[PDB]
Design a protein around this motif. Structure first.
Motif, mmCIF file in Angstrom:
data_model
loop_
_atom_site.group_PDB
_atom_site.id
_atom_site.type_symbol
_atom_site.label_atom_id
_atom_site.label_comp_id
_atom_site.label_asym_id
_atom_site.label_seq_id
_atom_site.Cartn_x
_atom_site.Cartn_y
_atom_site.Cartn_z
ATOM 1 N N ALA B 74 0.777 -1.230 0.000
ATOM 2 C CA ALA B 74 0.000 0.000 0.000
ATOM 3 C C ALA B 74 0.817 1.292 0.000
ATOM 4 C CB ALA B 74 -0.964 -0.010 1.169
ATOM 5 N N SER B 75 2.082 1.223 0.415
ATOM 6 C CA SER B 75 2.924 2.420 0.446
ATOM 7 C C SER B 75 3.629 2.672 -0.884
ATOM 8 C CB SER B 75 3.976 2.320 1.558
ATOM 9 O OG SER B 75 5.125 1.601 1.132
ATOM 10 N N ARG D 83 2.470 7.980 0.184
ATOM 11 C CA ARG D 83 3.700 7.430 -0.393
ATOM 12 C C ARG D 83 4.653 8.543 -0.780
ATOM 13 N NH1 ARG D 83 0.336 5.917 -5.610
ATOM 14 N NH2 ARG D 83 -1.356 4.636 -4.719
ATOM 15 N N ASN D 84 4.099 9.731 -1.003
ATOM 16 C CA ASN D 84 4.902 10.875 -1.396
ATOM 17 C C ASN D 84 5.293 11.763 -0.223
ATOM 18 O OD1 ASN D 84 5.031 10.521 -4.385
ATOM 19 N ND2 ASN D 84 2.796 10.666 -4.207
ATOM 20 N N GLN D 85 4.640 12.910 -0.085
ATOM 21 C CA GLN D 85 4.968 13.836 0.991
ATOM 22 C C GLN D 85 5.285 13.149 2.312
ATOM 23 O OE1 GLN D 85 1.812 16.597 2.229
ATOM 24 N NE2 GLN D 85 3.403 18.030 2.887
ATOM 25 N N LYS D 87 5.756 9.925 3.172
ATOM 26 C CA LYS D 87 6.854 8.984 3.055
ATOM 27 C C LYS D 87 8.198 9.679 2.886
ATOM 28 C CE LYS D 87 7.982 4.697 0.610
ATOM 29 N NZ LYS D 87 7.491 3.853 -0.513
ATOM 30 N N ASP D 88 8.228 10.745 2.089
ATOM 31 C CA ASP D 88 9.469 11.481 1.838
ATOM 32 C C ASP D 88 10.072 12.015 3.123
ATOM 33 O OD1 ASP D 88 8.820 13.069 -1.433
ATOM 34 O OD2 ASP D 88 9.126 10.973 -0.835
ATOM 35 N N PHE D 89 9.255 12.750 3.863
ATOM 36 C CA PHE D 89 9.654 13.347 5.126
ATOM 37 C C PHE D 89 10.150 12.287 6.110
ATOM 38 C CE2 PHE D 89 9.151 15.426 9.201
ATOM 39 C CZ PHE D 89 9.499 16.742 8.923
ATOM 40 N N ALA D 90 9.526 11.112 6.074
ATOM 41 C CA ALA D 90 9.875 10.026 6.980
ATOM 42 C C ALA D 90 11.174 9.309 6.644
ATOM 43 C CB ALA D 90 8.734 9.018 7.036
ATOM 44 N N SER D 91 11.608 9.408 5.395
ATOM 45 C CA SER D 91 12.825 8.735 4.966
ATOM 46 C C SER D 91 13.990 9.683 4.730
ATOM 47 C CB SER D 91 12.547 7.946 3.689
ATOM 48 O OG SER D 91 12.027 8.791 2.674
ATOM 49 N N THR D 92 13.754 10.974 4.933
ATOM 50 C CA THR D 92 14.780 11.986 4.710
ATOM 51 C C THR D 92 15.271 12.591 6.017
ATOM 52 O OG1 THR D 92 13.652 12.606 2.641
ATOM 53 C CG2 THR D 92 15.347 14.102 3.473
ATOM 54 N N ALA D 118 -1.791 2.339 3.841
ATOM 55 C CA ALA D 118 -0.525 2.809 3.291
ATOM 56 C C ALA D 118 0.253 3.524 4.389
ATOM 57 C CB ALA D 118 -0.768 3.750 2.119
ATOM 58 N N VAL D 122 4.165 2.762 5.900
ATOM 59 C CA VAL D 122 5.232 3.754 5.924
ATOM 60 C C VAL D 122 5.790 3.810 7.335
ATOM 61 C CG1 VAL D 122 5.818 6.191 5.705
ATOM 62 C CG2 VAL D 122 4.232 5.126 4.091
ATOM 63 N N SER E 45 8.777 20.000 1.767
ATOM 64 C CA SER E 45 9.129 18.704 2.326
ATOM 65 C C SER E 45 10.212 18.882 3.381
ATOM 66 C CB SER E 45 9.630 17.777 1.218
ATOM 67 O OG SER E 45 10.001 16.515 1.741
ATOM 68 N N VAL E 47 13.473 19.259 2.747
ATOM 69 C CA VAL E 47 14.562 18.388 2.345
ATOM 70 C C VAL E 47 15.684 19.201 1.716
ATOM 71 C CG1 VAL E 47 15.220 16.490 0.856
ATOM 72 C CG2 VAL E 47 12.986 16.482 1.973
ATOM 73 N N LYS E 212 14.882 13.279 -7.361
ATOM 74 C CA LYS E 212 13.881 14.318 -7.540
ATOM 75 C C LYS E 212 14.565 15.663 -7.399
ATOM 76 C CE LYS E 212 10.329 11.675 -4.972
ATOM 77 N NZ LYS E 212 9.208 11.808 -4.002
ATOM 78 N N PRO E 254 19.979 14.108 3.079
ATOM 79 C CA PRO E 254 20.099 12.736 2.571
ATOM 80 C C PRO E 254 18.928 11.844 2.973
ATOM 81 C CG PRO E 254 22.153 13.496 3.500
ATOM 82 C CD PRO E 254 21.068 14.394 4.022
ATOM 83 N N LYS E 255 19.223 10.561 3.133
ATOM 84 C CA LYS E 255 18.223 9.586 3.532
ATOM 85 C C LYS E 255 18.876 8.639 4.515
ATOM 86 C CE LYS E 255 15.100 9.793 -0.308
ATOM 87 N NZ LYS E 255 14.152 9.011 -1.146
ATOM 88 N N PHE E 256 18.197 8.360 5.622
ATOM 89 C CA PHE E 256 18.752 7.462 6.625
ATOM 90 C C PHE E 256 18.980 6.103 5.967
ATOM 91 C CE2 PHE E 256 16.794 10.508 9.618
ATOM 92 C CZ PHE E 256 15.653 10.881 8.927
#
Ligand SMILES: Nc1ncnc2c1ncn2[C@@H]1O[C@H](COP(=O)(O)OP(=O)(O)OP(O)(O)=S)[C@@H](O)[C@H]1O
Ligand SMILES: Nc1ncnc2c1ncn2[C@@H]1O[C@H](COP(=O)(O)OP(=O)(O)OP(O)(O)=S)[C@@H](O)[C@H]1O
Ligand SMILES: Nc1ncnc2c1ncn2[C@@H]1O[C@H](COP(=O)(O)OP(=O)(O)OP(O)(O)=S)[C@@H](O)[C@H]1O
Ligand SMILES: [Mg+2]
Ligand SMILES: [Mg+2]
Ligand SMILES: [Mg+2]
Lengths: 258, 316, 441, 322, 258
Positions: B74-75, D83-85, D87-92, D118, D122, E45, E47, E212, E254-256
């Motif tokens: 889903a993600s 999956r975007n905004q 997810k992005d913030f969570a992985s950056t 979803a 995340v 974001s 970033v 991106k 970056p990214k963890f």
């Protein structure tokens, strides 16, 4: 130092032009690699155009390829990769044993810049066809840049383009709703520039009609050879061919209904 | 770092799953052979589905899991486009694997996949089933279009028995040296209703805030009407008495009207003291009230009528 | 190694279990096509398959549609050019792709050439009722091809009576495929088994088909679960493996209805070995079918749980009522993606409770749910009565039509001289009659 | 000029009333570097939004906006946004200070199951670097897979204590006086929702105010938030119990139309006023609660104000034959 | 008198500048002073953050007596900025507490005055934060030579990893259709100093980014002919674009990765 296939394109741009030559009508294609060189045929998605390639061992600054290997690959992906390589670059094809992928090494004179890409191969169940050299009723030849213009021009008028070879004369016609389009060219040979000469070896008249869309796609091979060979016969697919210093890119186009 | 125990102690092999024995073994065998059919694994939350499929994936592909498995949940983007390209490309991918092994595509939370997309998936898994097999994981298989359904085996999963929940619960206790009580564990089991994830999560939250896992502590993090009180309210010999329990111990203490009913149902269910026929007629009532609570009318009055109707039955 | 549905996929129309009538109707059309063309498609032969450029196949999942279309094509020597939902068939790409082969011949048709069609295409536009937002205007452009094609065109779908499929109505020969016949599937399945080195009780092979509602593709997959699950089948195993397989993988929806309906579980003793909590849990073993299953056979038992001096009938009426209530609950659960917290109540009201009221000895036998396929009949017919209304609205709500279109039957079926008289004097045509004939029948 | 409801919004954690057990645990969690994913659930106006906002300030101070990502039902949060905004913030990683990031999803129960699912996936994949806080009025409207991912803190209705305290605060920074049992009335009628208290309290600071030093009574409140009064209500009962139908049918018909009351309100109050009597037979209680509960239910769907009223009189009367 | 008198040597300057923001950044408050112009902003974001510094040295005349705050929209501004011929001169003009800024274009031979008005964007935000000032590695290469490597790899992944190893700048991307790796070294061409590639390393660096952003970054390649890049594990990477009196710098998180 770990491969069953290792070719090194004299010019990187070559393999690109060779693939941009037909990556619009065909998606998946199997590249048969052997001692002498690389051979590959693939049918169109609409099953109307057959595409056959042939790359001779004389196009590589070095060509290995120990055992015979099949490289089934998606032209859209492969095309993205080749797009990487720059001018001063020696593209080297590399394939291990019973590959799952393929490497494309873009080295440079100045050994301070190396760029290698891996490309996952595809599993293609190619319906191998038996192409046989036939005796066509007519066999002309002309500058590819000209055939291009002609095809592009007429295609604006009709979805179909009729190619008539009568009394040693090349005539292309397009009859649409807005109007018609007629182009006729007579054979000749300019010693000033042999490459701009129109040939024509007729043995019997020929009147065939092809889908404008497929000709617009075939004319894309007009970056490999300054000339295009066309062989026509009332009972067989037309044959458009572009010559490569060590091979060729040919197209077999099935005609329309009478 | 704060490694969740649901993740840290996630079964890494088909063996560790305290799942549905019968079905899991079925998987164990497919793991040894390799003729894994397309399949839809469906069932309630947290019983070991997603774990299951991924574990099957490994024992089948070993070092190949990396290139022979494509997971899409889903993600991730899973629309018509991705289905018509990424997924298709994968199935068309060349990957030399042992005789009976096939690439696996894992679509988790498959009940979220729009129909149009599922529709565009059909042909792909039909044409390339000889090198690629699909595994669908969901709570509602009902959301999988039939064309896809007829293309695979349907494996239903059942909630975990209290025994099973108890086992993996102890296994974690030893590896974490958690101080527990029997009643404390009965509290988790009782509040997880067959959900292993839920159980573990609570267990950790319980230790993370009280160290010792005792009923009292457990029901503290859960923060729902304490079962004991709710029970003493359903069994009160006088309707007046139970209404007092509802007034003093439940409503006045600020518990949700939804909180009250739900526990009441859960407790009525395990009320061994009463008779099947009786517990069911009560449930029927608690539920009627419950649905009333859900339609907006979650008033004290309602809860009172509930207890009232209970007594009417437990007196007749 | 390969899936069974694959290795045991028909290789000649002489292996398509069922619809033989429709397969013929198909094959014929594909035969008289050249002539139909020669005659400008204006000569509806004794079959009608003569005024149609293209055929429209339709029917439930896994019944042979895609197999037939392909097979019928390969039998008449034609070459196949197919597309399906996995391809982008938007009006744009449609007109930039296949539009070009509508009047072209196979390039493969040459290097293959006595074939009389080898150099001709049969366009199979498959899974057409699957064209989503990824195919803007696809159906429209596709329905336009059915009128201007110069080569056989075959379209397949599952629901012909859909709104999205409307544009196809009058434009093509739609041949219907219904759910194959049990004997056909039973026979076929047997053949499979024998070659797969195992035997199965015709009662098991029988209920499967009943569960699969006719999905021959599903039964095959479902039947490949045995040999794939166990490691080594033996002389004795065959008779016992059926159990673990049938009561788990195969007919699990039955072992649920069984257990649930066994009075031994409601008696004081078993009442605590298999607790209220377990009974409710059985529901979550297939909360999809369980409610359908109980309703299906809660009245085909010899109760052993009745209160002293309580008639079988009385106890049934009580469960009847509960079944009714549970429905009310389901509707709400399905009216809000966020109401799953009501399922336990539904477990009680739709299964466990009704069961306890009549559980005991199994008089007849556990039957699959009648409701599903029965829901197809009713639905598939509302669509008919509907189109019939949107043709008579000129002459009462669609409801007042099926409850007043009674008299019409007479002056439309009476004797079948005054033929044309009434027919045309109704403002109806060919399909207007063929359609009204179906429902009325 | 913010309406009191917003005006007196806790600026810091120390300003949140009646949620101490939450404030303390949360703060301990941060100071001990073991902050888990959070779920703040409870009814309206209990301090949920106030609390994370404050908790977030206290944790990041001014680096707030660049270290915290907040979304609420007013925002778009479908599967794509996840999956975007999100997810992005969570992985950056963060751009400024070092540490873990914080995503606040307010009124998360307004999200769809697809999105929730979803979201959950995340939160699962980036739990080792980012912290999530979900807020809701009903946990039950949240996917079990989502809930099972965080530690829960139920915000219960504000207790007399807490609400009495805040009332005291507002009365100071506002020239306002509230009679003894008038504050009590305001309480009993706010059902623990601090929001409704601050609302009526300003519906008086702009009603009775003339000498700028008036006294708010029980009345001013009961009438303000259109709710019955013991006397009135407790009277309507008597007319129903003793007087004839025609007479009682009148008493009710007048008391509600003369005070703008609605059966719904009356019923409730009666049920409690009646809950203290020492009825004769137990069935009296039963049938009473039953029918009354049925009435209340049918009303929530709009039946026939007239009949439903006579129904209440009937039910109360009928049941009192013991 | 104008509290803000800013004349750009060439109107073609402020044009290449704003092209860096334009796409990745939405709105940007421009704070002016007595030594030049400065401005920053961040992605929704959080970033990437852009930091602009324009020195007076790149002005034919600058006079901003008292500091100002010019909030404005890049898409609206980028328009006004295109209305300038390669023969005009731009002049920023703002009054006391601007309610809209003025751009003036003028020739030097023919009377042609182009004055555009531009409302100002007030977002009630002015958080300018920078903390890093010492990285484990610093490298530089031509802005074009970079933008290439970037878009090449962007084709095979959503993430690109700039891996700084012992005197080897390495860019890698792993994706669905295949992988891609470009390894360029520090070299200097005595005849072409601009195309030279310098790299000073101290401690190894390994950090992945989201193509991106990395893409929107290489658009600042219009501001100069050479980009500087400084890396440091678990720290926003800094991409700086040199300019005569200032610069445009991007801070990408970056990214963890573990
Ligand atoms: N049968 C089981 N045996 C052991 N651990 C389990 C079992 N079921 C669940 N767990 C634990 O719960 C976590 C989540 O279980 P999952 O396999 O994701 O459940 P699920 O059925 O897929 O849930 P969904 O996605 O919400 S439907 C795992 O990482 C395990 O630690
Ligand atoms: N009538 C049939 N007779 C024999 N085998 C069948 C029949 N129908 C299906 N099968 C088996 O099921 C597989 C798929 O059948 P298809 O004809 O492709 O199904 P379908 O009717 O097109 O189904 P969809 O795509 O879900 S509509 C085949 O490869 C066969 O092995
Ligand atoms: N515990 C509390 N302490 C002090 N003031 C409070 C408290 N709860 C609510 N308030 C007041 O009520 C207003 C709303 O409180 P919020 O924190 O926004 O409530 P909430 O729990 O988020 O409500 P929802 O969105 O309806 S669920 C604030 O501006 C406060 O003035
Ligand atoms: Mg899962
Ligand atoms: Mg099909
Ligand atoms: Mg809120």
């Amino acid at each position: 130092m770990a491969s069953m296939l290792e070719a090194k394109f004299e010019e990187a741009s070559l393999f690109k032009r060779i693939i941009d030559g037909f990556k619009d009508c065909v998606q998946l294609v199997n590249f048969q690699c052997k001692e002498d060189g690389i051979i590959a045929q693939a049918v169109d998605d609409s099953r109307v155009l057959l595409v056959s390639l042939e790359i001779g061992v004389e196009a590589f600054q070095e060509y290995r390829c120990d055992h015979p290997v099949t490289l089934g690959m998606d032209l859209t992906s492969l095309s993205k990769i080749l797009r990487c390589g720059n001018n001063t670059d020696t593209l080297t094809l590399i394939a291990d044993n019973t590959p799952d992928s393929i490497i494309l090494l873009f080295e440079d004179t100045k050994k301070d810049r190396i760029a290698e890409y891996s490309l996952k191969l595809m599993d293609i169940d190619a319906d191998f066809l038996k192409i046989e050299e036939l005796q066509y009723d007519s066999t002309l030849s002309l500058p590819s840049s000209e055939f291009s213009k002609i095809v592009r021009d007429l295609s604006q008028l009709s979805d179909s383009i009729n190619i008539m070879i009568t009394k040693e004369t090349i005539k292309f016609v397009a009859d649409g709703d807005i109007g018609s389009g007629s182009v006729i060219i007579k054979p000749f040979v300019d010693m000033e520039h042999p490459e701009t000469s129109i040939k024509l070896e007729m043995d019997q008249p020929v009147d065939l009609t092809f889908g404008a869309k497929y000709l617009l796609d075939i004319i894309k091979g007009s970056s490999l050879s300054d000339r295009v060979g066309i062989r026509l016969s009332s009972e067989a697919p037309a044959l458009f061919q572009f010559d490569l210093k060590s091979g060729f890119l040919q197209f077999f186009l099935a005609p329309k209904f009478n | 770092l704060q490694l969740p125990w649901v993740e840290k102690y996630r079964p890494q092999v088909l063996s560790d799953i305290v799942g549905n024995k019968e079905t899991i073994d079925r998987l164990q065998q497919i793991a040894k052979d390799g003729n894994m059919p397309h399949m839809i694994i469906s069932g309630m939350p947290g019983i070991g589905k997603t774990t299951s499929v991924h574990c099957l994936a490994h024992e089948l592909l070993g070092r190949s899991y990396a290139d022979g498995v494509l997971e899409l949940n889903a993600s991730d983007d899973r629309g018509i486009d991705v289905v018509r390209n990424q997924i298709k490309h994968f199935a068309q991918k060349k990957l030399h694997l042992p005789p009976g092994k096939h690439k696996i595509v894992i679509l988790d939370e498959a009940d979220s996949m729009t129909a149009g997309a599922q529709q565009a998936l059909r042909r792909t898994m039909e044409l390339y089933s000889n090198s690629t097999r699909f595994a669908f994981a969901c709570n509602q298989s009902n959301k999988i279009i039939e064309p896809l359904q007829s293309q695979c085996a349907i494996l239903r999963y059942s909630k975990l028995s209290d025994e099973d929940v108890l086992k993996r619960l102890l296994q974690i206790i030893k590896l974490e040296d958690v101080k527990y009580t029997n009643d404390g564990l009965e509290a988790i089991i009782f509040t997880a209703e067959g959900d292993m994830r839920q159980a573990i999560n609570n267990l950790q939250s319980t230790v993370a805030g009280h160290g010792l896992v005792n009923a009292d502590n457990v029901f503290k993090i859960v923060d729902s009407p304490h079962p004991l009180i709710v029970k003493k309210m359903l069994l009160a010999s006088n309707l007046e008495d139970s209404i007092q329990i509802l007034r003093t111990d439940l409503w006045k203490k600020g518990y949700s009207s939804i909180d009250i009913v739900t526990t009441s149902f859960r407790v009525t269910k395990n009320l061994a003291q009463v008779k099947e026929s009786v517990r069911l007629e009560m449930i029927k009532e608690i539920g009627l009230t419950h649905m009333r609570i859900l339609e907006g009318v979650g008033t004290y009055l309602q809860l009172a009528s509930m207890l009232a109707k209970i007594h009417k039955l437990n007196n007749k | 190694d390969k899936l069974w549905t694959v290795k045991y996929a028909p290789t000649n129309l002489q292996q398509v279990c069922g619809n033989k009538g429709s397969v013929m109707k198909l094959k014929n059309w594909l035969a008289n096509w050249e002539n139909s063309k020669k005659n400008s498609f204006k000569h509806a032969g004794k079959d009608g398959s003569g005024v149609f450029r293209a055929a429209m196949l339709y029917g439930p999942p896994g019944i042979g549609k895609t197999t037939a279309a392909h097979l019928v094509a390969q039998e008449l020597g034609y070459d196949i050019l197919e597309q399906n939902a996995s391809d982008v068939r938007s009006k744009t790409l449609l007109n930039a792709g296949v539009k070009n082969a509508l009047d072209n011949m196979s390039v493969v048709g040459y290097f293959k050439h006595q074939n009389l069609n080898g150099k001709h295409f049969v366009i199979i536009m498959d899974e057409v009722d699957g064209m989503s937002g990824g195919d803007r205007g696809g159906v429209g452009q596709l329905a336009q091809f059915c009128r201007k094609t110069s080569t056989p065109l075959i379209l397949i779908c599952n629901e012909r009576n859909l709104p999205k499929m409307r544009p196809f109505d009058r434009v093509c020969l739609d041949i219907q495929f219904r759910r194959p016949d049990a004997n056909s599937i039973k026979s076929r399945l047997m053949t499979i088994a024998i070659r797969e080195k195992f035997k199965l009780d015709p009662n098991v092979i029988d209920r499967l088909i009943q569960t699969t509602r006719g999905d021959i593709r599903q039964v095959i997959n479902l039947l490949s679960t045995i040999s794939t699950t166990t490691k080594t089948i033996n002389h004795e195993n065959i008779n016992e493996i059926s159990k673990a397989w049938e009561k788990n993988i195969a007919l699990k929806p039955f072992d649920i209805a069984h257990k649930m309906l066994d009075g031994q579980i409601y008696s004081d003793i078993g009442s605590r070995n298999f607790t209220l909590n377990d009974k409710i849990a059985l529901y979550f073993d297939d909360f999809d079918f369980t409610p359908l299953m109980i309703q299906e056979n809660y009245l085909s038992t010899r109760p052993s749980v009745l209160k002293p001096g309580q008639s079988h009938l009385e106890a049934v009426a009580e469960a009847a009522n509960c079944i009714s209530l549970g429905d009310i609950v389901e509707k709400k659960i399905r009216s809000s993606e966020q109401l799953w917290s009501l399922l336990p109540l539904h477990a009680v009201l739709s299964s466990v409770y009704p069961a306890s009221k009549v559980a005991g000895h199994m008089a007849g036998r556990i039957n699959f749910t009648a409701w599903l396929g029965q829901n197809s009949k009713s639905a598939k017919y509302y669509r008919l009565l509907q189109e019939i209304h949107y043709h008579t609205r000129l002459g009462x709500x669609x409801x007042x039509x099926x409850x007043x279109x009674x008299x019409x039957x007479x002056x439309x079926x009476x004797x079948x001289x005054x033929x044309x008289x009434x027919x045309x004097x109704x403002x109806x045509x060919x399909x207007x009659x063929x359609x009204x004939x179906x429902x009325x029948x | 000029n913010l309406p009191w409801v917003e005006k007196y919004r806790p600026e810091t954690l120390d300003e949140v009333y009646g949620q101490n057990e939450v404030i303390t645990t949360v703060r301990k969690f941060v100071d001990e570097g073991k902050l888990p994913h959070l779920l703040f659930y409870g009814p309206p106006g209990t301090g949920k939004t106030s609390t994370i906002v404050a908790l977030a300030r206290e944790i990041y101070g001014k680096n707030y906006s660049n270290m915290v990502l907040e979304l609420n039902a007013s925002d778009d949060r479908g599967i794509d946004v996840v999956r975007n905004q999100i997810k992005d913030f969570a992985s950056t990683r963060q751009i400024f200070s070092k540490g873990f990031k914080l995503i606040i999803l307010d009124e998360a129960d307004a999200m769809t199951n697809a999105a929730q699912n979803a979201l959950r996936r995340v939160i699962e994949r980036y739990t080792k670097n980012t912290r999530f806080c979900v807020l809701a009025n009903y946990a039950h409207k949240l996917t079990p897979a989502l809930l099972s991912q965080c530690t829960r803190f139920r915000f219960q209705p504000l207790p007399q204590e807490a609400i009495e305290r805040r009332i005291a605060n507002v009365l100071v920074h506002e020239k306002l006086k509230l009679s003894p049992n008038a504050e009590k009335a305001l309480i009993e009628l706010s059902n623990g929702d601090m929001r409704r208290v601050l609302n009526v309290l300003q519906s008086c600071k702009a009603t009775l105010d003339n000498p700028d030093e008036d006294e708010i009574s029980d009345d001013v409140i009961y009438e303000c938030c259109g709710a019955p009064r013991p006397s009135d209500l407790k009277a309507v009962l008597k007319s129903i119990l003793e007087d004839d139908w025609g007479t009682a049918h009148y008493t009710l018909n007048k008391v509600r139309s003369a005070k703008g009351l609605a059966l719904i309100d009356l019923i409730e109050g009666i049920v409690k006023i009646l809950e203290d009597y020492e009825l004769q037979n137990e069935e009296t209680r039963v049938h009473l609660l039953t029918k009354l509960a049925d009435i209340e239910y049918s009303i929530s769907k709009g039946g026939n104000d007239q009949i439903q009223g006579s129904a209440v009189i009937g039910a109360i009367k009928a049941s009192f034959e013991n």
